[PDB]
Design an enzyme around this catalytic site. Structure first.
Site, PDB file in Angstrom:
ATOM      1  CE1 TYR A  45      -2.102  -3.136   7.962  1.00 37.38           C
ATOM      2  CE2 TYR A  45      -2.060  -0.611   7.872  1.00 37.38           C
ATOM      3  CZ  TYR A  45      -2.814  -1.855   8.392  1.00 37.38           C
ATOM      4  OH  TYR A  45      -3.769  -1.981   9.074  1.00 37.38           O
ATOM      5  CG  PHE A  55      -4.782 -10.577   4.105  1.00 34.46           C
ATOM      6  CD1 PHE A  55      -5.334  -9.296   3.369  1.00 34.46           C
ATOM      7  CD2 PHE A  55      -3.491 -11.176   3.606  1.00 34.46           C
ATOM      8  CE1 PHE A  55      -4.576  -8.793   2.358  1.00 34.46           C
ATOM      9  CE2 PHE A  55      -3.001 -10.438   2.501  1.00 34.46           C
ATOM     10  CZ  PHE A  55      -3.278  -9.287   2.054  1.00 34.46           C
ATOM     11  CG  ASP A  56      -5.294  -5.133   8.887  1.00 35.70           C
ATOM     12  OD1 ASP A  56      -6.279  -4.496   8.181  1.00 35.70           O
ATOM     13  OD2 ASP A  56      -4.630  -4.551   9.615  1.00 35.70           O
ATOM     14  CB  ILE A  75       3.367  -3.828  17.453  1.00 35.13           C
ATOM     15  CG1 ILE A  75       3.405  -3.901  15.821  1.00 35.13           C
ATOM     16  CG2 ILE A  75       1.927  -4.568  17.757  1.00 35.13           C
ATOM     17  CD1 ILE A  75       3.537  -5.338  15.262  1.00 35.13           C
ATOM     18  CE1 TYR A 101      -1.418  -5.851  18.903  1.00 32.42           C
ATOM     19  CE2 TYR A 101      -0.430  -7.193  17.036  1.00 32.42           C
ATOM     20  CZ  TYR A 101      -1.012  -6.093  17.433  1.00 32.42           C
ATOM     21  OH  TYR A 101      -1.422  -5.090  16.862  1.00 32.42           O
ATOM     22  CG  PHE A 118       2.944  -5.758   9.024  1.00 34.40           C
ATOM     23  CD1 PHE A 118       3.322  -6.350  10.074  1.00 34.40           C
ATOM     24  CD2 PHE A 118       1.614  -5.154   9.123  1.00 34.40           C
ATOM     25  CE1 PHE A 118       2.621  -6.400  11.332  1.00 34.40           C
ATOM     26  CE2 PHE A 118       0.702  -5.160   9.909  1.00 34.40           C
ATOM     27  CZ  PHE A 118       1.404  -5.808  11.347  1.00 34.40           C
TER      28      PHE A 118
HETATM   29  C1  LIG Z   1      -4.833  -5.640  17.391  1.00 31.37           C
HETATM   30  O1  LIG Z   1      -5.677  -4.780  16.630  1.00 31.37           O
HETATM   31  C2  LIG Z   1      -5.523  -4.667  15.399  1.00 31.37           C
HETATM   32  C3  LIG Z   1      -4.266  -5.000  14.657  1.00 31.37           C
HETATM   33  C4  LIG Z   1      -4.284  -4.866  13.485  1.00 31.37           C
HETATM   34  C5  LIG Z   1      -5.514  -4.454  12.814  1.00 31.37           C
HETATM   35  C6  LIG Z   1      -6.349  -3.918  13.524  1.00 31.37           C
HETATM   36  O2  LIG Z   1      -7.625  -3.519  12.591  1.00 31.37           O
HETATM   37  C7  LIG Z   1      -7.398  -2.935  11.538  1.00 31.37           C
HETATM   38  C8  LIG Z   1      -6.673  -4.214  14.678  1.00 31.37           C
HETATM   39  O3  LIG Z   1      -7.822  -3.842  15.225  1.00 31.37           O
HETATM   40  C9  LIG Z   1      -8.009  -2.606  16.320  1.00 31.37           C
HETATM   41  C10 LIG Z   1      -7.923  -1.628  15.574  1.00 31.37           C
HETATM   42  N1  LIG Z   1      -6.657  -1.016  15.173  1.00 31.37           N
HETATM   43  C11 LIG Z   1      -5.486  -0.770  15.829  1.00 31.37           C
HETATM   44  C12 LIG Z   1      -4.638  -0.162  15.008  1.00 31.37           C
HETATM   45  N2  LIG Z   1      -5.133  -0.665  13.793  1.00 31.37           N
HETATM   46  N3  LIG Z   1      -6.523  -0.745  14.027  1.00 31.37           N
HETATM   47  C13 LIG Z   1      -3.276   0.125  15.136  1.00 31.37           C
HETATM   48  C14 LIG Z   1      -2.486  -0.387  16.586  1.00 31.37           C
HETATM   49  C15 LIG Z   1      -2.353  -2.121  16.627  1.00 31.37           C
HETATM   50  O4  LIG Z   1      -2.000  -2.510  15.147  1.00 31.37           O
HETATM   51  C16 LIG Z   1      -0.730  -2.250  15.166  1.00 31.37           C
HETATM   52  O5  LIG Z   1       0.103  -1.962  15.907  1.00 31.37           O
HETATM   53  C17 LIG Z   1      -0.089  -3.013  13.618  1.00 31.37           C
HETATM   54  C18 LIG Z   1       0.701  -2.060  13.007  1.00 31.37           C
HETATM   55  C19 LIG Z   1      -0.207  -1.010  12.275  1.00 31.37           C
HETATM   56  C20 LIG Z   1      -1.199  -1.697  11.320  1.00 31.37           C
HETATM   57  C21 LIG Z   1      -1.966  -2.576  12.257  1.00 31.37           C
HETATM   58  N4  LIG Z   1      -1.276  -3.426  12.924  1.00 31.37           N
HETATM   59  C22 LIG Z   1      -1.877  -4.864  13.235  1.00 31.37           C
HETATM   60  O6  LIG Z   1      -1.205  -5.485  14.042  1.00 31.37           O
HETATM   61  C23 LIG Z   1      -3.085  -5.480  12.517  1.00 31.37           C
HETATM   62  C24 LIG Z   1      -2.944  -6.761  12.423  1.00 31.37           C
HETATM   63  C25 LIG Z   1      -2.049  -7.288  11.480  1.00 31.37           C
HETATM   64  C26 LIG Z   1      -2.019  -8.769  11.378  1.00 31.37           C
HETATM   65  C27 LIG Z   1      -3.373  -9.317  10.837  1.00 31.37           C
HETATM   66  C28 LIG Z   1      -4.157  -9.001  11.869  1.00 31.37           C
HETATM   67  C29 LIG Z   1      -4.413  -7.387  12.135  1.00 31.37           C
END
Ligand SMILES: COc1cc2cc(OC)c1OCCn1cc(nn1)CCCOC(=O)[C@@H]1CCCCN1C(=O)[C@H]2C1CCCCC1
Length: 128
Positions: A45, A55-56, A75, A101, A118
């Site tokens: 992703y 951006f991630d 989420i 969120y 995404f």
């Molecule tokens: C809210 O904290 C984060 C959110 C996202 C990326 C983060 O770090 C890489 C992150 O930091 C904490 C560590 N973490 C958690 C997760 N993955 N890493 C999965 C669960 C929470 O994330 C999600 O549920 C969703 C869907 C699965 C991939 C990650 N994701 C995100 O929301 C990213 C966001 C995307 C938008 C830009 C900033 C990071």
């Protein structure tokens, strides 16, 4: 850009039909099966605030992101959206804050009331 196109052409995949999660299939995948709650899912992703501003990418760690579907380990929009996808599919999701969120956000990384985008590639899914 890709977010605006999802606004334009994206299918509403919410039960409530509140446009909270919009989906475009960018690349059609294969087979009929879509994953079930409890399945182990593997994706690549890229994610960003609809802004552009954070951006991630899983490709930034050069390895798949793995989670169990439909347990709130991600989420709400992911549990909903990935459940619709076939193996090999690439989808774009655009997500209202209620399915991400929320009003609280996840500060400092994610602000209050953020829309998220995404691009997800569903690599595989297996039974628990
Ligand atoms: C809210 O904290 C984060 C959110 C996202 C990326 C983060 O770090 C890489 C992150 O930091 C904490 C560590 N973490 C958690 C997760 N993955 N890493 C999965 C669960 C929470 O994330 C999600 O549920 C969703 C869907 C699965 C991939 C990650 N994701 C995100 O929301 C990213 C966001 C995307 C938008 C830009 C900033 C990071």
């Amino acid at each position: 850009g890709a977010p605006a196109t999802v606004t334009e052409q994206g299918e509403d995949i919410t039960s409530k039909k509140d446009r909270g999660v919009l989906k475009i299939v960018k690349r059609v995948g294969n087979g009929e099966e879509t994953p079930m709650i409890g399945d182990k899912v593997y994706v690549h992703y890229k994610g960003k605030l609809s802004n552009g501003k954070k951006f991630d990418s899983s490709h930034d760690r050069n390895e798949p992101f793995v989670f169990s579907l439909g347990k709130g380990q991600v989420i709400k929009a992911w549990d909903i959206g990935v459940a619709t996808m076939k193996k090999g599919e690439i989808a774009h999701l655009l997500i209202k804050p209620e399915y991400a969120y929320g009003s609280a956000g996840s500060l400092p990384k994610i602000p209050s009331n953020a829309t998220l985008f995404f691009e997800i590639e569903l690599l595989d899914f297996k039974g628990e």
